[PDB]
Design a protein around this ligand. Sequence first.
Ligand code: J5S
Length: 225
Amino acid sequence: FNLISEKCDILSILRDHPENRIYRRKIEELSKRFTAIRKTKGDRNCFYRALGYSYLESLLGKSREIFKFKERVLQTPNDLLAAGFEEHKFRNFFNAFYSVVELVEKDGSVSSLLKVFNDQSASDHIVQFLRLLTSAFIRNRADFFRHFIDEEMDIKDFCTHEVEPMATECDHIQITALSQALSIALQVEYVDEMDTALNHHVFPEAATPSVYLLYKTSHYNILYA
Ligand SMILES: *CC(=O)/N=C/c1ccc(C)cc1
């Protein structure tokens, strides 16, 4: 369980910030709204790894939602090809993501899903697939990211340097892009060391979330409502 942990009580993370007034206040508040947490390894891949695991976990036992997600995943090779990725270079990463989706359908257990995401090889193939898909979806919608995010940014250089490579950190653009690319509704809770309100953002704005993440000390952990 070195990449994604077992579930722990929310108040168990007080020990990560001992004798810190502001962290203690916000974790106590968070505990009023959430019951449990899973921790992720802080290796620069934790956003992709957390979102991937938590979203597939939320599908277990839901036969219609699994059918619809499988249908979308089968079309993602077309997104990658439209953005200029070559099939023989994405094949190994697509095949690893499709395999874990069939595992959700066929096997249906938390234990089996958690083993794949703690297997360094399988888990890293999954993360690399999610990074390529994020890149593709941004590149195919460059005017949308320029219009609504940043009219001055260089989209192709940004994807090359800050999306595709393993261990590169995320920002709002990557979160928005992967959310839209797989139709995943997610809520991020923010815990920083300023004397401010505990606050959250939902991606996309309207939505009812599937997934809850805690962003704290540059790190994304998984929350349970
Ligand atoms: C999301 C992820 O893997 N974060 C890792 C991390 C932890 C701490 C710092 C300072 C940078 C990156």
